[PDB]
């Protein structure tokens, strides 16, 4: 029992890498739905610059 | 008295060895039956936990 944890540990660490990797497609799909349910007009310009 | 005590005495005495044996026959029969059912628990065990 004792050894499988230290690898799960290791598989979360990769969520994290690819958590932060993640941060970058909520940042694009955050505005994306923002425009969408904005649902009365999208300026895209207005930066939010979300992470 | 001769014959029947000195027949009874052997087929008692024979009877009694014979009996002595069987009783071991059990004895380490179930016994190591115990102890192989040791093993097997043992092997079900390290199984169990490590599905765990």
Do not use: C
């Amino acid at each position: 029992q004792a050894e499988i944890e230290a690898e799960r540990k290791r598989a979360r660490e990769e969520l994290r890498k690819q958590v932060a990797i993640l941060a970058v497609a909520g940042a694009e799909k955050i505005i994306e739905r923002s425009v969408d349910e904005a649902a009365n007009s999208d300026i895209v310009d207005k930066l939010v610059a979300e992470l | 008295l001769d014959l029947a005590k000195a027949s009874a005495t052997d087929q008692l005495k024979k009877a009694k060895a014979e009996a002595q044996v069987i009783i071991e026959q059990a004895n380490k029969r179930r016994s190591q039956i115990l102890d192989e059912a040791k093993a097997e628990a043992e092997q079900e065990r390290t199984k169990i936990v490590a599905q765990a």
